[PDB]
Amino acid sequence: PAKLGYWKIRGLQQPVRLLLEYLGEEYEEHLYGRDDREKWLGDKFNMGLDLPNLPYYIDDKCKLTQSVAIMRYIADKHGMLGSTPEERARISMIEGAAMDLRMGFVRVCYNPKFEEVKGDYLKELPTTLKMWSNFLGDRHYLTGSSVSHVDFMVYEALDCIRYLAPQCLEDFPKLKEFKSRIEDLPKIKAYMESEKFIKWPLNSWIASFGGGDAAPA
Amino acid sequence: PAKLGYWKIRGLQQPVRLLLEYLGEEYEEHLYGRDDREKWLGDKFNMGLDLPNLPYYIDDKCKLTQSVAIMRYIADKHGMLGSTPEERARISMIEGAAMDLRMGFVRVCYNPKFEEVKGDYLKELPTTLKMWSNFLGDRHYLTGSSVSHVDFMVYEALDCIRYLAPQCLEDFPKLKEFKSRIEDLPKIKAYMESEKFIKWPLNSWIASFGGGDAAPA
Numbered sequence: 001p002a003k004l005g006y007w008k009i010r011g012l013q014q015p016v017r018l019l020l021e022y023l024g025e026e027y028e029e030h031l032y033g034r035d036d037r038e039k040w041l042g043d044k045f046n047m048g049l050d051l052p053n054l055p056y057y058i059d060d061k062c063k064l065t066q067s068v069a070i071m072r073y074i075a076d077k078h079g080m081l082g083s084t085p086e087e088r089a090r091i092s093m094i095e096g097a098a099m100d101l102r103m104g105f106v107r108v109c110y111n112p113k114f115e116e117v118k119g120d121y122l123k124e125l126p127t128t129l130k131m132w133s134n135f136l137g138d139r140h141y142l143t144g145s146s147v148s149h150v151d152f153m154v155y156e157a158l159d160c161i162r163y164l165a166p167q168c169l170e171d172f173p174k175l176k177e178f179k180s181r182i183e184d185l186p187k188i189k190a191y192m193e194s195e196k197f198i199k200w201p202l203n204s205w206i207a208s209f210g211g212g213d214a215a216p217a
Numbered sequence: 218p219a220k221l222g223y224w225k226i227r228g229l230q231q232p233v234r235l236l237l238e239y240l241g242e243e244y245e246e247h248l249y250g251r252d253d254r255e256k257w258l259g260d261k262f263n264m265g266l267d268l269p270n271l272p273y274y275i276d277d278k279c280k281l282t283q284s285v286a287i288m289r290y291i292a293d294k295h296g297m298l299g300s301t302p303e304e305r306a307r308i309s310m311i312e313g314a315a316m317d318l319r320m321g322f323v324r325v326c327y328n329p330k331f332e333e334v335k336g337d338y339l340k341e342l343p344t345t346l347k348m349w350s351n352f353l354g355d356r357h358y359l360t361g362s363s364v365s366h367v368d369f370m371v372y373e374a375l376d377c378i379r380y381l382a383p384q385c386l387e388d389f390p391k392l393k394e395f396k397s398r399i400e401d402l403p404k405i406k407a408y409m410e411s412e413k414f415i416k417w418p419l420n421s422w423i424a425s426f427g428g429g430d431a432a433p434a
């Protein structure tokens with residue numbers, strides 16, 4: 001199997017987890033707990049990684065860091081990246097916008113004054129969600145009728161964002177719909193129920209939101 | 218034949234500018250000045266962009282946002298992205314790491330309390346550089362002996378960073394040589410000496426650092 005590693009959090013790794021599970025690809029993941037930082041600092045430079053970082057992916061053929069590069073590699077092996085330069089670019093665009101969606105949630109959650117700036121993120125949030133809703137249109141998924149790694153990225157961002165704004169998707173039922181379609185996919189549903197599934201934390205433990213040891217309610 | 222658009226700043230667009238200039242590709246860019254926020258918002262949803270954002274790229278066969286997606290499209294047309302899944306993935310990794318290098322500089326430059334957080338950034342900066350230096354080794358460029366879009370990304374991040382830490386490259390002569398090699402590139406040197414070159418600001422005008430209406434130092 002492929003070997004992966006990350007913190008025992010959702011973060012940037014969830015979408016790759018989801019992708020692998022969807023494709024039924026075999027993997028084992030080394031999970032670094034909250035108090036394993038020092039442990040990583042000594043694996044970091046000894047796995048043969050060109051640009052050491054978390055997450056990583058290691059198999060017989062390839063050694064990789066950068067979560068989207070990892071997803072893209074897995075997808076590339078299954079011919080999922082696009083058949084033309086314009087198809088591939090379009091997927092690269094959705095991918096980058098998806099990262100923006102996730103990272104916008106990172107930069108609000110890692111504010112030292114979180115409880116006094118969440119008011120503004122949430123104000124610009126509907127505009128951002130409207131853009132995604134419009135882009136989806138009547139398609140089942142972001143790139144057409146087949147699932148793409150990009151769908152797992154957006155899915156994860158949406159499932160995270162709703163912990164802050166639980167009702168954010170009420171105005172965007174095509175995004176809600178999209179969200180459930182992903183959750184209801186047989187391999188994804190089975191996985192979301194499994195022992196291996198990580199539901200918390202969203203971000204690293206130290207974040208003002210999306211961290212800690214338990215979800216808020 | 219190709220139409221682009223961005224703020225009249227360096228930011229995320231420089232590497233695409235550089236790439237186009239290097240490849241001798243023909244293009245014309247709409248530049249939004251500091252007094253043009255509202256001019257952009259009036260264009261933002263009127264150009265047929267699937268996911269409206271800055272920068273954008275529009276031509277005969279394709280409309281795009283996301284700067285790296287744009288660079289990847291241009292590079293894809295010239296067969297520069299990799300011949301195998303593992304080659305393509307490794308380029309995708311360097312690309313992501315390059316974005317981390319640039320964004321770490323963003324994260325410090327837009328930080329409300331700049332002079333306070335620059336200490337920790339400048340503290341970590343050598344470990345990051347050391348990583349890039351080690352990855353480069355004796356190669357002329359990041360992916361071998363040919364120039365990649367990835368090289369322009371790292372180049373731009375390095376040229377930006379030295380305005381915050383002017384000495385940072387002296388412990389790393391190979392990176393220093395990489396800088397020169399790119400600047401020495403015939404078509405690059407030319408564009409950099411042209412009237413088309415945006416030299417400042419590095420980030421948006423409003424940043425704590427790399428900002429202002431012009432700044433020699």
Ligand SMILES: [Cl-]
Pocket residue numbers: 022185186187188
């Ligand atoms: Cl399934």
Ligand SMILES: [Cl-]
Pocket residue numbers: 239402403404405
């Ligand atoms: Cl040249």
